[PDB]
Symmetry: T
Subunit: 160 residues, 12 copies
Amino acid sequence: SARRTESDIQGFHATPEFGGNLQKVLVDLIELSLQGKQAHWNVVGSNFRDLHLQLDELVDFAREGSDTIAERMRALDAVPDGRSDTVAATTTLPEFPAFERSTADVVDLITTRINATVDTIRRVHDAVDAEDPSTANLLHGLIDGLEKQAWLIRSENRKV
Amino acid sequence: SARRTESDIQGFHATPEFGGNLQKVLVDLIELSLQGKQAHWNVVGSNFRDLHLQLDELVDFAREGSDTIAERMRALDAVPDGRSDTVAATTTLPEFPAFERSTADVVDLITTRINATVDTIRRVHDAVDAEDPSTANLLHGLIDGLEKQAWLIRSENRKV
Amino acid sequence: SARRTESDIQGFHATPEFGGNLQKVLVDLIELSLQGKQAHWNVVGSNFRDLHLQLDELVDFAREGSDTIAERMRALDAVPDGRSDTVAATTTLPEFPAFERSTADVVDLITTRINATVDTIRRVHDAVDAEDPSTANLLHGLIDGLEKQAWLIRSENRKV
Amino acid sequence: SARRTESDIQGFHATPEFGGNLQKVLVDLIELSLQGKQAHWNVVGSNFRDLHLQLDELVDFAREGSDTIAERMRALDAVPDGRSDTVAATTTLPEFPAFERSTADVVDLITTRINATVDTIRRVHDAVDAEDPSTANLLHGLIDGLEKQAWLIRSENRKV
Amino acid sequence: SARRTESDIQGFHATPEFGGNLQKVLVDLIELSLQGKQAHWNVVGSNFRDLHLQLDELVDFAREGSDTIAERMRALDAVPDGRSDTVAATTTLPEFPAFERSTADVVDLITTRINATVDTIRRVHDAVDAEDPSTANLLHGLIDGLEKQAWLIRSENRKV
Amino acid sequence: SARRTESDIQGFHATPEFGGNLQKVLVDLIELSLQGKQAHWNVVGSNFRDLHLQLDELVDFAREGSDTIAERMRALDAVPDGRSDTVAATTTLPEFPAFERSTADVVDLITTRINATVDTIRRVHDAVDAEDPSTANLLHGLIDGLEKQAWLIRSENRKV
Amino acid sequence: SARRTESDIQGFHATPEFGGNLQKVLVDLIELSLQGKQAHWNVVGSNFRDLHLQLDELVDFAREGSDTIAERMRALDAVPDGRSDTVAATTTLPEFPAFERSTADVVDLITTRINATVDTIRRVHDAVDAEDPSTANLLHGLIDGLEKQAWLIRSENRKV
Amino acid sequence: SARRTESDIQGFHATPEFGGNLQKVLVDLIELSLQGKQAHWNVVGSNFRDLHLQLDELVDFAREGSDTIAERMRALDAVPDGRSDTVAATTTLPEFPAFERSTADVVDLITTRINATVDTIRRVHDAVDAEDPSTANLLHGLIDGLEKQAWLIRSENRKV
Amino acid sequence: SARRTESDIQGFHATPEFGGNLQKVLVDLIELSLQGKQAHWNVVGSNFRDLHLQLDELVDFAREGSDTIAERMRALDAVPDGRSDTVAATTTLPEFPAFERSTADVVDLITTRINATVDTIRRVHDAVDAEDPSTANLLHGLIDGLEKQAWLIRSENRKV
Amino acid sequence: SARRTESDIQGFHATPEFGGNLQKVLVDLIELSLQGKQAHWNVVGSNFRDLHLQLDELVDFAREGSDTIAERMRALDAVPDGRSDTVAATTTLPEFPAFERSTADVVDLITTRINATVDTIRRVHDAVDAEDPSTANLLHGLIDGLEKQAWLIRSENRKV
Amino acid sequence: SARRTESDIQGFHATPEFGGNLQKVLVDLIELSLQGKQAHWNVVGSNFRDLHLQLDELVDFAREGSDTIAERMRALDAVPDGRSDTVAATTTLPEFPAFERSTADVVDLITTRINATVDTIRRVHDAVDAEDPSTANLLHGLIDGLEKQAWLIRSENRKV
Amino acid sequence: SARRTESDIQGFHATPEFGGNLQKVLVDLIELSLQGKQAHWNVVGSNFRDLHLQLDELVDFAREGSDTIAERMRALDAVPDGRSDTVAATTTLPEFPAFERSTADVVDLITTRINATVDTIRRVHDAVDAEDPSTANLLHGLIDGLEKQAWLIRSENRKV
Ligand SMILES: [Cl-]
Ligand SMILES: [Cl-]
Ligand SMILES: [Cl-]
Ligand SMILES: [Cl-]
Ligand SMILES: [Fe+2]
Ligand SMILES: [Fe+2]
Ligand SMILES: [Fe+2]
Ligand SMILES: [Fe+2]
Ligand SMILES: [Fe+2]
Ligand SMILES: [Fe+2]
Ligand SMILES: [Fe+2]
Ligand SMILES: [Fe+2]
Ligand SMILES: [Fe+2]
Ligand SMILES: [Fe+2]
Ligand SMILES: [Fe+2]
Ligand SMILES: [Fe+2]
Ligand SMILES: [Mg+2]
Ligand SMILES: [Mg+2]
Ligand SMILES: [Mg+2]
Ligand SMILES: [Mg+2]
Ligand SMILES: [Mg+2]
């Protein structure tokens, strides 16, 4: 009665631009995960353990975030690229330095890299929201979670 | 002292239109749940097990979704109708066919029905968001979750 | 030695009548689940919370029951029909009323609907047991569980 | 290489008005949690246990909510004040009465105070959303959750 | 529409003899659980710990069994009596002795008392099954479980 | 250097008075458990479910309590007697009435029986504490736990 | 006082025929377990993973089933023989073929072997039920569980 | 034989002095909880994370403690007052300062406030123990738990 | 750059001799599992329960071991044979005797069968290690676990 | 209004006598833990498994006990010494013998050593209670727990 | 006294070659992780779901493996480099192709890449084992785990 | 039939030197666990909590390690000696100091003592491996785990 008589109903298709916007978020989340693990392993000095542990929590969040974004792309028939070459060639994050780094340095370095990642999400937000508010919801989750990590990490170096 | 002195403070009340819009979402979520179980029981053929299992995950999400929407109606002083006669008389989803269906047919059929359910949510979205953004947030969760199910189901039939 | 030399041994096949008998149970279990959720959402008044919660437990049991019955049908190569139109057209349960209902009314209404569902299982029991005692075992579980729910719900309205 | 150069990328900082708006939400959430426990301990009469238990769920939600808001403030460089004197001096919630209170009275009292808490969040919503949609997402969760609690609690006193 | 009309469909009610038969099972289950704890506390000697632990498992099973039977009585409009005076006055189990008892003695004593409990259930089985096969299903679980306990306990005293 | 050279070091053992006092606690705990289940099964009327559930929680605590006391006796070379005849013959608890009882009646009946049980523990407390403060600690747990149960149950019948 | 005064009460003893009948069930359950693992390890081809996993679930059920039957024999003073030589010499199941087998062949092969195992249980059912209905209940569980496995496995090969 | 024949047996009730003493403990526990969260949110500097985490554990314990004391009051017919105005007006704890505070400062501040809370419990201990040793047991748990928290926190600022 | 330009890279292939060596381990693990269950069911006498339980733990380990070995064979493209006929025809373990066996006898019997199984693993160890050290690692796990079981079981019969 | 204005509020600290008394408990708990493991590893003979398992449970409790006492010392500004040399030099426990020991011997040996440990706690109890009843509470837990362990172990060698 | 008297005892230090060898393993494990996710997101076609899920299990193992290797480097005073640029510049794995790939192609592609990763571990094995057998043990775990993944993935494409 | 004949197949027995080498590892593991707890309780100063927690993880690992070694000795017919006097008299670990120690000092002290424990295992490794590779596998786990702990602890004191 109210039933649609259509045998093939199409779902929501993302524009290629929308897919490209999520791709920008994806590579920065993957890069953040890789840099987070680098910091996690190579951090040394005063309050090593807290930072070591907090960095793993950041990596967990960024990895879950990259899944969320890539899966959202797929749901809307965009196609993600999380390969190493693409991530290195297109990430906006400043390169993480090599070798052992002090806890103080790692705090400042990782805070900057989190903030860079959040900036990318904030930059594409309005364009994403305009096409698909449901995806903007996912972006809000990432912004909230990453900005929480930034606070939890940077607070170590704060002097009051 | 910033304390209010009213003995009676009323809650947010949904308009009849708003109530009607959530009712539209509700009946399609219940119908999708019922069709999902039908497909889950009656699918046979190549890759039976994967689809059988994925369909149960779809049903779980749709059932949780119907609860969310119905409870949201109740919170806003609206009254849901999820009775079988009402669902059958008012759902926009094409009827699920009777008897055993092949994996390939079930994939196509259910994808269309998920697409139809999501279309209803997308159709009422802006009107809901205009009156109550907090409810639109719930709708974003439903859209994201269902379109993910559509991807996980439909990909069986996608060739190269 | 004692091994059967048969390359293709057939399993137990249910008669169509047996399948039809389980189908009667299936539609009443599905209808009970739908009515239970309707009551769960729309119940109001004294002792709201207990009934709200108990009704969800009833729905959980009826949903698990419908899976059990439909899966048993499939195991014996019967084909279930749990679609909304079929449920509405063939259920023996009295229609659940629309709108908010008092806890006292809901208690009486749902007790009657549980008892109707149990009656269907009791009605087909002997015919089912005669063909397949193993399925009668499943029916015993449903009778026991539903009659427990009837007691737990109806006790609210009992005056001694 | 699309890598950014800067070593000190600063995070999103909230305006004083934004921090002030989240502070308003925070004090009302803390007050609600304190009032919720007061009601939880001191409620007596018909259907005591259900209300006793539901009030604990409300408190749990309000406490998680206060953490969410205070932490969001910290993430955005704002400073929460959840101290007893501040909460008492600035909460908009009508004072909860001391001593034992009937279930019927507690239902009415707590519903009013939940509605007051929600009103604060609804009042600041648009200003919060205008500056930071990600924070508005957190507000939506709070509105949804608290309005659910209001329904679950107030339904006890409903007439027909 | 195959919907029934009646608003007050009554449930299956047990005959006085049926309730009496379940009452017989109930008192022997409660007595066994009390005797099981008595043995659990007071057993001493070679292989104490194994018997101590196994007796607790027996008690657990007997207690769950008593709940099952008493609740089944309630479901079928019968009224259990599990009070201490009634249990003592009507149990068919041989009295368990007071004071410390050897493991070997406890094995023999408890095996006899389990067997007595099973005998009661076996004695009422056919009359229960004739009136209500669903209840006989519950009896089968009790027979199976208790006879397993008897084997696990008595095997301690076996010769070759 | 400080090692004792004794081959057999004996444990602290209870005096006959002490053993007798714990036995008094034991029988009232078992009797409360038995009456608790009787009430649990046979309670009917307004707010049935809450009382039904709370009575099971009371029984769980009383059962754990009886184990605690009986095991403490065994630890101190005393012998418990939790057999039905002994419990019925020596309990100080007023007899629980037969048949179905209203929720209001069960509240008053059970509150009285909990209070009787606590009175027994309070009556023996000082004598127990004088001989063995470690056992008095166990009594404090029981008093606290049972008096909480009394509050949670009795509050149903309070009118303010 | 309704207490029995026998110092020795014997348990239910199975006849040799009954013991033999359960032994027939046991050897086919063990053989099915062994063949299930063989198939699980050696299946290759289209939809490998689903079958690999489902076969492990079948093995788990058959192993649990063999335990149930063997323990039931022990409870009734019968003596199981699950040794490899006996299983190989007395199983009624057709031999599982050697080496790697295709998914399609494994589906057909295992379905036949489940069918064979269930046939043994159905063949001995009435004789078992006549002597001991409680054991027949266990058989009903085995029939239901195994025929469910047969459906979940065989449906891979069922076309339209 | 030993059964009391009283229809109404009353529970142990707190004297006004006793109720007053527990109220004193209650407000300091709630105040500690509130200051604990304030410190948790606003702590910054060296070893932020450890302190952030430890303060949450302190708050969890203080919250459980406040429930314990308030529930104990209710059990003994006393009425708690945990409202914000009352806590602020009657707490003995030194006020927690506003704004961000260094880890070193928070360690000293919180240690002092924990000690103040414990002092209150130690001050009321003997009077509580004299009237009701069972409640003194609860006080012992609180003293032990809070003094552990003080050690775990203060140790950060120790120099040896 | 360092990337291999090969479109099809082959994995490690086990020699047929290596596969045959793992096959020897596999049949003895399967035989040990079958004999362990035989002992588990049929053991009687002093300390029945401990042995009954320990034998199940041995069986669990041997079953997990057989999976490990068979899966390792498959990973390296060997093909396991765990069929009943093959196990009986090729196992090196002495046959387990029929009928009920005393705990003392079972201890000695099972210790010998564990030791036989370990001997097979030790016999093939060097040949396995020489081709694939990673598989020798798995053998070390089995040797350690089985030799632990041998100690735990045999200790029952040790006289010092 | 009632707020203390002190900047530094000090915690309760143990006197040298108190610290010394807890140290005495600490070394006997650690020694018991060490002997418990020695017995656990080296026990052989009849009922090996039960004793092996029970000794591990004893060790778990003694280890938790040692943590409790040492942490209590730290909370009260006392310094524990649980080093091997100190434990060996100052423990009151009779030395555990070397080599394999029979189950009968281990039962007697360990019971004696548990009793020695409890004696130490009972000897210091009153002095501890006089200074700090909160710590006496911890001692009550240890006495109760260890005396339970003594009962569970010693009962093996009892003959009645 | 066998105690050493050095105030400083250094740990095992890896040679530069050893560090380099683990670095080779690390970059291929990270690359495999990244390629695994790419395949997981972008696979479409027959048996999509099984591969999608299995690829996630592969990624989990490879991520855990990279952690193990990097942490082992840190333990032995070596410094890992898991940054994207380094992984892309130094991995031996063939590049994963862009865009959607069929199930069959993904099976072949990923199998080759697992084979490549395992080859690196096998290539460095002997050099690692020669310097530090404990690290070789970790390598054995990686080889076993990855070759198992290769089997579970590749078997989809293996025909008869 | 490839079945062996012997009824008494003996297990692998360790040489006196082998048992002696495992005894060396055992005493150093027990000593480390005792020193670890000493440090855990008595550490104070900057980053107390992290070290406090990490030291407990070390103790957990060392205790599991000691069980592993002692049980392996038992499996191979060797007899462990983990008694306090033996540990003190034969441990190679430098004595841990008494009293409170700074975090910086504890980091250096514990790192040295972990390294000493690892050195013992590294010293006996080749002789253990030569006689029994399966035991060397256990040593590898210990080396890996302890060297990880050393890194996690020592990194606190690292400079740049
Ligand atoms: Cl509830
Ligand atoms: Cl799956
Ligand atoms: Cl931490
Ligand atoms: Cl056990
Ligand atoms: Fe994903
Ligand atoms: Fe719901
Ligand atoms: Fe189902
Ligand atoms: Fe928080
Ligand atoms: Fe019950
Ligand atoms: Fe007990
Ligand atoms: Fe079994
Ligand atoms: Fe509470
Ligand atoms: Fe396997
Ligand atoms: Fe500790
Ligand atoms: Fe890691
Ligand atoms: Fe151990
Ligand atoms: Mg599949
Ligand atoms: Mg209620
Ligand atoms: Mg006390
Ligand atoms: Mg720290
Ligand atoms: Mg035993």
